Amino acid sequence: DRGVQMLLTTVGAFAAFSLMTIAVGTDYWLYSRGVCKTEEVMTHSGLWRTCCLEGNFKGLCKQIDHFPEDADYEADTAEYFLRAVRASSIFPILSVILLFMGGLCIAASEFYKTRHNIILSAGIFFVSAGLSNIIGIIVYISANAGSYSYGWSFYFGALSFIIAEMVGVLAVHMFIDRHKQLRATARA
Amino acid sequence: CVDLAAEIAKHCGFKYKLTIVGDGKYGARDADTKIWNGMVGELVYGKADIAIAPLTITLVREEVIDFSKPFMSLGISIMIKKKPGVFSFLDPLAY
Amino acid sequence: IFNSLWFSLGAFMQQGCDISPRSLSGRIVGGVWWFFTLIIISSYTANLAAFLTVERMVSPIESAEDLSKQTEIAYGTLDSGSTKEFFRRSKIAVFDKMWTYMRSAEPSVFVRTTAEGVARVRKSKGKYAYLLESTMNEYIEQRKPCDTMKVGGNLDSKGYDIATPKGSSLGTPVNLAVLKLSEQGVLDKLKNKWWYDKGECTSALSLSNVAGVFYILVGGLGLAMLVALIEFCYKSRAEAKRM
Amino acid sequence: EIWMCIVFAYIGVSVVLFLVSRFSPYEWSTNEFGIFNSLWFSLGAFMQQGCDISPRSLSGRIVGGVWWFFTLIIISSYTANLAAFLTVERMVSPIESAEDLSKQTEIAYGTLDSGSTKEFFRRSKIAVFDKMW
Amino acid sequence: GECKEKTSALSLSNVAGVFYILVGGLGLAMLVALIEFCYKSR
Amino acid sequence: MKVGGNLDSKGYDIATPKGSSLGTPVNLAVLKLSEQGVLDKLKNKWWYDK
Amino acid sequence: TYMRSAEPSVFVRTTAEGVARVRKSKGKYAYLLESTMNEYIEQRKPCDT
């Protein structure tokens, strides 16, 4: 039905936004061993800083130096571009921005029933948020590559992409139904 | 060596004075004058009473200067210098 | 013209096509394009396999003999010292040929001083190898910027001992003390402390190898979405004005 | 990571193709690209098995083209890497140093019940040599 | 004495023949289509 | 097989009576074989070649 | 360093048997012998060496 579909869309959008916001803010993205407060000790790292685990310096988080200018090496401009993208975390942040925009537009869909084009904008925003989350995952993994494990915070972003993409399908399916309703009413 | 010298001095219970060889040479045999300089010559001529330094135990220095058992073993080693492009999937074919 | 480009793209990507040429000339074009596509795709796959196999076959130098056989990476000792004299007197098949390379080698790989030899190793990017003692090798390995690494075992055996003038009262007490320190672990502990405590320092294809294809895919998805919205807006504004 | 990103890219491509195929109210459906059919098309494209349908719009065709290029590169890379793995046999010892032995606990190790080796390790200040003692 | 398993990017000389065959086939197709059109016109 | 490295350093030598005159030529002759490579050659023939 | 430590021993009492050992080992065994007289063998039947 229409009401259950709208409720499911709202719940999915809220869940995706919450999951992606938690994943961006939380530090349990990658489990790896690294030097604390720059000895070797197992730590967990997020997007901005890493906190050491079961060590002498357990509990304090130190900001990851995204630019390793210790050797003053530049190599190619592509490496600098990728490093700048990873450091700013532009793509996960723009993914949460797009998710928030889509959710707010879905909420505003109730205010304006006649204007049907906005739910299409919500679907577009959800699809773009999913694509940007994928780009961010690819960039993050590539930067990390240049033993480890992925924590639940990283999988929260992965689950957020699936939920947001499922909602984008549902939102677009509504715009199809809305135009079918308009044409069917005009036909009769 | 200084911490090693401290243990040696502490074990034998004698005061030690740390100095530096003026020419900064480990010491080698000279064919022209047969006069030893550097680290090896300091002990022979009485300028030093004991040498605690990375001195290689060789035949030339052994036959005049008494060498203790090697406290550190070494040998000749090798020193060497210890990210794919984004479009590295087009590498197999030329541009 | 639009459908022809689509058929050609689908044929090159070796994917299904909704349409196929029916005339003689159209089928000739399709057949030659299919042969070209098959050859090119097989060539790409074969060359990538050769690249990966050759990379996997690359064995890094570990010991002297494997390094001795190859000649791609140059190496040399100091301009003086017992390192050169050891090579001349050595008659081992690994070591007799060792001397024979820098003797006939241009430019001269001999280095005036150790510091310059280490410095030229960093800029060599692995092209040059330096042969020094084992004890101080680890120290430079532990020095910044931590780009050099000691590999393999010691070629020969040497040692450092306390030097005492002959017929001195400090002869035997130091020798006993040297043995005492080694057997007490203090000498061993002191050796480990300064080198390390004071120190200043796969097979599967990774996502970095194929990140460009992901970037191109998502860029194409974004471009297609942009085109879809542009055409939708144009069509909507075309009919709204007409109505 | 490549497999995970392959699954994610497949889902994203299916959703984007379904969106660009059936969102426009001025294309009615002329095409058969629902969400289920878009998933089927993307799965068939990845496995190089083809399908009974093909996108007919410019945007859908762009999506199909980039997905086909991605699939070609990925499948060729998989085949090439499997060939490299089968051609060259690499064996790496699980333990390469005494420090690694201390880090692990699965493989047991010991020395003489009475000898110099056993008597050496008691008075060892080394952090590596003290932890595994 | 002072004195293979190599790999390199495939160059155009390695696959120039297939390009020649492709262009020849395009020319043959064009010629056949023109011949058919001329025959139908006559 | 041998893996890792030697954590401790030891030596293996010829024992002679304390103050025995023959000991000094023995140690010197031990050195002579070391520089000429006779010692390591004997090491290989009883460890590697055999 | 091979035939001293190898089971079975690769020593052959006579030249003729050593060639026959090679002719039986389908190429897994080799023989060392004088070059000129060996060249005489490879020109004889069945020319398998």
Author numbering:
A (entry chain F): 5 to 42, 55 to 162, 173 to 214
B (entry chain C): 425 to 506, 511 to 523
C (entry chain C): 573 to 773, 784 to 825
D (entry chain B): 524 to 551, 567 to 671
E (entry chain D): 771 to 773, 781 to 819
F (entry chain B): 721 to 770
G (entry chain A): 672 to 720
Sentences from the paper on this structure:
AMPA glutamate receptors (AMPARs) are ion channel tetramers that mediate the majority of fast excitatory synaptic transmission.
We next determined cryo-EM structures of the GluA2–TARPγ2 receptor under two different pH conditions in an apo state (in the absence of l-glutamate). When comparing the LBD sector between the two pH conditions, we noticed greater conformational heterogeneity of the LBDs at pH 5.5 versus pH 8.0, which is reflected in the local resolution maps of the consensus refinement. These lead to an approximation of the LBD upper (D1) lobes between the BD subunits at pH 5.5 and to rearrangements of their G helices (inset), which mark LBD conformations in different states of the gating cycle. While protons also target the LBD tier directly, as evident from strong, pH-dependent changes in GluA2delNTD desensitization, the lack of NTD BD contacts amplifies conformational rearrangements in the LBD and TMD sectors that are associated with desensitization. Taken together, protonation induces multiple changes throughout the receptor assembly, including rupture of the NTD tier, rearrangements of the LBD pairs and rotational movements of the TARPs, culminating in reduced charge transfer through the receptor channel.
